[PDB]
Amino acid sequence: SGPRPRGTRGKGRRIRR
RNA sequence: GGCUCGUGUAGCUCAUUAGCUCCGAGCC
């Protein structure tokens, strides 16, 4: 998690599914 | 790692509604 959640899994695999 | 899929028991960035790495899927 960051200053929002996670954005992604690091090769475009974008998070909040 | 090169790339693609899966919030998941998760971390690290500073994003930009995100990003990169895990923890698995599949093949280098």
Curated annotation (Swiss-Prot):
Sequence ranges of Basic residues compositional bias: 3-17
Motif Nuclear localization signal and RNA-binding (TAR) in this chain: 4-17
Localization per record: Host nucleus, Host nucleolus
Superkingdom per UniProt: Viruses
Similarity-based family: Belongs to the lentiviruses Tat family.
Note: The sequence shown is that of isolate R29-127.
Complex and partners: Binds to bovine CCNT1/cyclin-T1. Also binds human, equine and mouse CCNT1.
Function noted in UniProt: Nuclear transcriptional activator of viral gene expression, that is essential for viral transcription from the LTR promoter and replication. Acts as a sequence-specific molecular adapter, directing components of the cellular transcription machinery to the viral RNA to promote processive transcription elongation by the RNA polymerase II (RNA pol II) complex, thereby increasing the level of full-length transcripts. Tat binds to a hairpin structure at the 5'-end of all nascent viral mRNAs referred to as the transactivation responsive RNA element (TAR RNA) in a CCNT1-independent mode.
Protein name (Swiss-Prot/TrEMBL): Protein Tat
Lineage of the species this protein comes from: Viruses, Riboviria, Pararnavirae, Artverviricota, Revtraviricetes
Name of the gene encoding the protein in the UniProt record: tat
